[PDB]
Design a protein around this ligand. Structure first.
Ligand SMILES: [Zn+2]
Ligand SMILES: [Zn+2]
Lengths: 56, 56
DNA sequence: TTCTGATAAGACTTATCTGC
DNA sequence: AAGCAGATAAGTCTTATCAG
């Protein structure tokens, strides 16, 4: 998280790690990634509510 | 396939098996399913091009 | 502490397989 | 044969984690 920063795309404000869009504008991990792979914004419709944990 | 039938949601016209929306209107397998689980239309943005095969 | 990449967990989509 | 509704999985894709 962080105070004063919102996802420039999914607009969420709680994302493990923040990244930057190809415009220097803050984006939540999901988004940041999704764009790097689809070179198109992140269809906000798959905007999930909470965040999942994971395992190694 | 089938002549004269288009996906009432994803508009595709090639879907393994056709289903019906809760309005009796033809829908391609993906859609038909996605709605039964999300009780909301199928975000067309995840409209895939071709169709994948699978294995058992 | 910040942020970009690479890796890979396993959540979701949706093709199949059945039973009407 | 045909058309459709439900269940059950199958990898595909999304995306939390791990490094640099
Ligand atoms: Zn976002
Ligand atoms: Zn459809």
């Amino acid at each position: 998280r962080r105070a004063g920063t919102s996802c420039a795309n999914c607009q969420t404000t709680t994302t493990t790690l923040w990244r930057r869009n190809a415009n220097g504008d803050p984006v939540c991990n999901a988004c940041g990634l999704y764009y790097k792979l689809h070179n198109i914004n992140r269809p906000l419709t798959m905007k999930k509510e909470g965040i999942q944990t994971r395992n190694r």
